[PDB]
Write a protein that binds this DNA or RNA. Structure first.
Lengths: 12, 12
RNA sequence: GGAGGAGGAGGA
RNA sequence: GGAGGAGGAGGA
């Protein structure tokens, strides 16, 4: 995991 | 250095 | 949190 | 670029 990790919600 | 590193232009 | 830089809109 | 998560607006 990184931040919001590849849990890409907005998916930046 | 990190990205734009503590070269904080805006300094997000 | 620096190991990415992918990205700066967080900063550290 | 994953080790931070600080931050997700990049994603990798």
């Amino acid at each position: 995991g990184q931040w919001n990790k590849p849990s890409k919600p907005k998916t930046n």
